[PDB]
Amino acid sequence: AETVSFNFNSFSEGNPAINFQGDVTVLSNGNIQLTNLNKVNSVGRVLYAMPVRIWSSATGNVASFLTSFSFEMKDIKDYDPADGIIFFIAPEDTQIPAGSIGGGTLGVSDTKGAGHFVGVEFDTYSNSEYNDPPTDHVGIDVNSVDSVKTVPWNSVSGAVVKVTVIYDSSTKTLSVAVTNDNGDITTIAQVVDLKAKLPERVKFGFSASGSLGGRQIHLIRSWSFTSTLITT
Amino acid sequence: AETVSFNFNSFSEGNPAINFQGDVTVLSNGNIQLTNLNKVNSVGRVLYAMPVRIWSSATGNVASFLTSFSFEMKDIKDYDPADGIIFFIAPEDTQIPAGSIGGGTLGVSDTKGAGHFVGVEFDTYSNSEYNDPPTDHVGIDVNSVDSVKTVPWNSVSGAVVKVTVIYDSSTKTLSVAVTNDNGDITTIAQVVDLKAKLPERVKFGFSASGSLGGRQIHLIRSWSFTSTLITT
Amino acid sequence: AETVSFNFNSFSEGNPAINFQGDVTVLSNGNIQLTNLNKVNSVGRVLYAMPVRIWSSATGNVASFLTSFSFEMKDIKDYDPADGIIFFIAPEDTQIPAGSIGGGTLGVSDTKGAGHFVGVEFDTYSNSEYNDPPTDHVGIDVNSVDSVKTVPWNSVSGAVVKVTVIYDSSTKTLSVAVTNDNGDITTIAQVVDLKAKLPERVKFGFSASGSLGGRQIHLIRSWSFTSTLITT
Amino acid sequence: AETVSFNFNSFSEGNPAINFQGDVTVLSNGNIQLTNLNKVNSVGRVLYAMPVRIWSSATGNVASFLTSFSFEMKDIKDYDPADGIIFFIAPEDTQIPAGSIGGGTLGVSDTKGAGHFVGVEFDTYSNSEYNDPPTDHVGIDVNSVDSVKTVPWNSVSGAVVKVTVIYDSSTKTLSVAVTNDNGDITTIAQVVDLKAKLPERVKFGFSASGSLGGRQIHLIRSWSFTSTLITT
Numbered sequence: 001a002e003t004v005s006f007n008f009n010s011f012s013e014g015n016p017a018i019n020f021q022g023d024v025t026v027l028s029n030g031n032i033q034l035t036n037l038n039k040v041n042s043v044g045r046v047l048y049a050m051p052v053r054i055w056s057s058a059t060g061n062v063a064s065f066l067t068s069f070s071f072e073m074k075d076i077k078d079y080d081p082a083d084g085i086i087f088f089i090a091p092e093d094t095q096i097p098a099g100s101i102g103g104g105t106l107g108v109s110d111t112k113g114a115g116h117f118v119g120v121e122f123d124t125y126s127n128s129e130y131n132d133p134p135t136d137h138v139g140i141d142v143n144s145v146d147s148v149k150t151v152p153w154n155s156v157s158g159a160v161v162k163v164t165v166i167y168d169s170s171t172k173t174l175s176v177a178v179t180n181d182n183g184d185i186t187t188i189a190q191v192v193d194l195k196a197k198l199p200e201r202v203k204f205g206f207s208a209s210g211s212l213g214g215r216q217i218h219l220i221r222s223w224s225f226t227s228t229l230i231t232t
Numbered sequence: 233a234e235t236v237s238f239n240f241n242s243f244s245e246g247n248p249a250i251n252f253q254g255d256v257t258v259l260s261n262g263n264i265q266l267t268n269l270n271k272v273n274s275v276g277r278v279l280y281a282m283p284v285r286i287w288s289s290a291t292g293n294v295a296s297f298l299t300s301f302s303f304e305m306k307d308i309k310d311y312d313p314a315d316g317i318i319f320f321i322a323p324e325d326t327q328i329p330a331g332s333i334g335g336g337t338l339g340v341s342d343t344k345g346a347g348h349f350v351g352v353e354f355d356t357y358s359n360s361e362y363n364d365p366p367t368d369h370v371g372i373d374v375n376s377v378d379s380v381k382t383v384p385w386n387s388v389s390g391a392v393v394k395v396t397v398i399y400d401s402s403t404k405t406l407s408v409a410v411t412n413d414n415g416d417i418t419t420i421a422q423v424v425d426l427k428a429k430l431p432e433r434v435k436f437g438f439s440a441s442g443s444l445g446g447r448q449i450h451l452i453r454s455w456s457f458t459s460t461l462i463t464t
Numbered sequence: 465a466e467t468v469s470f471n472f473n474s475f476s477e478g479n480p481a482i483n484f485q486g487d488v489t490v491l492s493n494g495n496i497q498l499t500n501l502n503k504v505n506s507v508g509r510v511l512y513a514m515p516v517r518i519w520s521s522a523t524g525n526v527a528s529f530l531t532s533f534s535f536e537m538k539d540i541k542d543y544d545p546a547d548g549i550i551f552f553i554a555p556e557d558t559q560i561p562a563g564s565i566g567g568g569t570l571g572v573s574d575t576k577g578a579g580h581f582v583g584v585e586f587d588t589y590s591n592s593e594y595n596d597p598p599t600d601h602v603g604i605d606v607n608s609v610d611s612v613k614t615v616p617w618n619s620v621s622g623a624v625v626k627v628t629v630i631y632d633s634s635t636k637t638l639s640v641a642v643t644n645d646n647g648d649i650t651t652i653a654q655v656v657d658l659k660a661k662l663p664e665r666v667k668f669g670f671s672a673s674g675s676l677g678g679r680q681i682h683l684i685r686s687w688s689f690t691s692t693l694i695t696t
Numbered sequence: 697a698e699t700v701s702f703n704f705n706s707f708s709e710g711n712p713a714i715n716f717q718g719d720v721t722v723l724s725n726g727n728i729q730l731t732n733l734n735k736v737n738s739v740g741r742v743l744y745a746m747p748v749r750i751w752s753s754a755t756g757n758v759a760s761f762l763t764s765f766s767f768e769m770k771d772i773k774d775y776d777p778a779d780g781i782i783f784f785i786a787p788e789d790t791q792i793p794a795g796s797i798g799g800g801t802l803g804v805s806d807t808k809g810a811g812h813f814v815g816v817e818f819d820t821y822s823n824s825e826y827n828d829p830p831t832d833h834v835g836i837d838v839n840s841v842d843s844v845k846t847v848p849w850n851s852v853s854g855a856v857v858k859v860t861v862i863y864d865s866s867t868k869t870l871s872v873a874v875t876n877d878n879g880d881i882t883t884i885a886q887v888v889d890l891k892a893k894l895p896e897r898v899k900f901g902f903s904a905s906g907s908l909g910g911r912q913i914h915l916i917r918s919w920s921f922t923s924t925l926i927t928t
């Protein structure tokens with residue numbers, strides 16, 4: 001019964017529990033703003049400092065986790081949304097890809113759109129090079145920004161979005177429940193074998209990118225997480 | 233985009249949005265007690281008054297829902313904990329079975345343990361006749377209390393438990409996340425084709441049940457539900 | 465080495481280990497409900513039957529105690545929550561003030577807010593005539609509901625709150641650490657000379673009150689106490 | 697508010713949330729054995745891997761924390777009970793002192809008994825050189841094993857001890873409540889300004905040592921922590 005669990009309803013620079021990468025910044029109201037509105041191909045990632053052990057090579061066991069968070073995207077003259085946020089899980093040594101071009105890489109993949117991570121994205125800009133659907137979408141990414149599975153969605157400027165992700169180790173099923181501003185929910189689920197795609201010790205976090213013409217305000221308002229791993 | 237959603241911090245007799253069946257009763261604190269400690273083979277169920285359309289034959293669409301609630305199961309001498317609580321979905325006409333012997337059935341099945349429903353059960357007494365696990369478990373039931381899949385759990389007398397369940401129509405994956413009082417989480421997921429097990433219109437509720445030797449307190453503390461059906 | 469220690473997980477009417485006063489009542493699950501929601505200016509106090517000796521005239525020593533208890537306060541239509549719960553220490557011959565008007569007095573002080581007691585209060589209603597902070601708070605009271613020291617606190621409806629108190633005889637220090645639902649802790653400490661504010665023998669207990677337009681559910685879910693006095 | 701909060705019912709190698717130093721070993725029963733029974737001047741320390749920020753240079757505010765743990769010491773033929781266990785707070789670069797003689801120092805200071813730390817010791821051997829009271833005892837240490845204050849305490853072999861600590865930042869009051877096997881409790885409280893004795897970011901841990909002739913079994917059974925810093 002090994003269990004990790006933290007909870008932030010706000011943030012503050014200096015908190016050792018959080019690692020900052022890229023153009024990340026903390027607003028005077030505890031909000032985390034992932035990108036820089038004057039930088040080209042701006043990328044900003046935020047990770048939970050302490051690495052979590054999602055699976056043990058000693059017991060074959062994979063941990064389960066229930067996490068939920070709330071983000072918000074808002075438009076800015078005169079750019080076009082850029083192109084979103086992504087909740088990812090990667091190896092502990094994870095760093096913004098070298099020479100990151102932002103954009104469709106969302107700050108976690110290389111140019112080909114590949115990388116070593118598993119995540120859920122809230123994509124707001126269609127990128128033909130990665131097979132993005134023609135509309136805002138939610139997709140489960142496994143080592144590539146070319147989502148293994150997507151679903152129509154719609155990002156509403158200035159609207160707060162509540163997401164609840166559940167990963168059940170028994171079936172190896174990652175489920176996502178998105179509750180939009182107006183009240184409707186958008187779900188999407190996919191079987192993903194963490195023990196076969198990631199190393200025992202990984203880290204959790206959010207990443208947001210941008211481009212030259214495509215730029216917007218990405219904000220992470222709160223985050224609660226709990227990962228329980230059976231040890232027997 | 234058809235959406236039904238409600239929130240119950242505390243319940244109260246006389247509220248039209250709720251239906252009462254069996255030995256149900258509302259405590260002076262706004263909690264629903266499902267069984268009666270004095271009756272033999274006691275059974276009580278609470279249903280959300282207004283029925284919910286979870287799928288439409290015209291469209292072929294199935295709705296996805298997000299629901300979370302909290303409960304408490306406290307002990308009493310000289311009785312054994314019986315038998316647990318169950319979150320279920322059934323035909324809008326659903327009524328407590330005729331001659332319901334209580335016990336394992338959980339107030340949703342007959343002596344054979346068969347019925348017309350789909351639900352998650354936080355089972356606390358092991359009923360050998362229903363291929364029950366040797367311990368307190370959580371399980372996914374489909375037209376029977378002889379679970380399709382169970383996972384080792386632990387009910388802690390007098391402990392307030394939190395549960396979150398996500399249903400994804402696209403994959404038809406019912407995922408549950410039990411958050412024990414000590415922080416550990418328990419999870420179980422399963423593929424259940426709702427469209428193929430229940431009518432277009434159904435009702436969501438809670439049922440508990442006791443036996444002769446086994447009896448205990450079942451309290452439903454709070455309930456919030458939201459389902460969305462694509463209408464196109 | 466004279467020690468007094470009892471551990472209550474749930475309660476029950478009759479048990480001669482607890483004295484009931486006022487509108488107290490016991491829920492079906494062992495929870496104590498200190499007030500009546502129909503009575504105007506209700507008051508309810510629960511005490512530990514057997515009195516405890518906190519200080520000896522001979523040895524001159526003062527006892528030390530470590531107590532912890534979880535409580536809950538839930539809202540109701542359409543009243544203002546009132547007014548809080550107070551853990552207190554008073555003379556073995558203690559009774560509810562003859563003429564208790566309820567309100568902020570919390571069933572321990574008169575209309576002037578004065579009384580012969582010592583306690584830690586969890587006040588939710590600001591009563592300007594007792595010099596109450598503008599927000600919910602936790603204060604150390606000594607012979608008055610007009611706190612000697614207080615701290616901003618947030619009472620959540622339907623949230624189980626856990627409290628741990630430590631009294632150090634050597635320093636005559638009273639340390640309180642409150643743990644809210646969400647995880648955060650609130651703490652208040654204060655130096656209080658019991659040997660000079662109470663009689664050799666006292667009684668420990670819980671007390672809550674209601675008013676006319678102000679009423680709410682006060683619940684004591686559990687309580688455990690342990691005091692130790694040296695005789696050398 | 698900034699809150700750090702963990703909880704360990706047991707431990708096990710691998711868990712990235714725990715740092716080991718010295719002769720720490722993890723028993724199959726999930727217990728931690730701090731010293732080695734076959735080494736001379738053995739020393740073993742265990743720490744929460746992530747550094748906690750106990751105060752901020754920005755706001756100036758100091759954090760408050762509530763922690764409780766359980767441990768057990770046990771004799772062995774034919775060595776004398778060595779010589780204690782200590783709960784400490786130190787800078788993030790805290791390591792076992794170079795060439796530690798063990799014993800008297802408890803593994804956290806130099807031969808002179810000095811060091812950089814704030815702790816609570818459970819001293820089971822009298823070291824005249826550090827001014828140890830003649831009997832076993834509990835003390836509050838501030839940068840030296842020559843306690844700033846102490847209180848008589850008996851260490852019963854094989855007896856499980858449960859501790860509760862509550863630091864109130866508004867008074868800088870460290871309060872300890874020790875519950876002995878028999879049921880009696882021991883208290884001790886000392887004012888210690890952490891913002892003046894420690895850096896912004898610190899680590900929490902347990903240490904124990906031994907000598908050539910003095911050796912015993914030091915076990916940590918469980919540990920739960922929770923700190924909260926106001927951020928405004």
Ligand SMILES: [Ca+2]
Binds near residue numbers: 104
């Ligand atoms: Ca894109």
Ligand SMILES: [Ca+2]
Binds near residue numbers: 335336355358359364
């Ligand atoms: Ca059963």
Ligand SMILES: [Ca+2]
Binds near residue numbers: 569596
């Ligand atoms: Ca008041």
Ligand SMILES: [Ca+2]
Binds near residue numbers: 779780799819823828
């Ligand atoms: Ca010593």
Ligand SMILES: [Mn+2]
Binds near residue numbers: 130132146
């Ligand atoms: Mn995409």
Ligand SMILES: [Mn+2]
Binds near residue numbers: 377378
């Ligand atoms: Mn079962």
Ligand SMILES: [Mn+2]
Binds near residue numbers: 585596597603609611
């Ligand atoms: Mn007050």
Ligand SMILES: [Mn+2]
Binds near residue numbers: 817
């Ligand atoms: Mn000492």
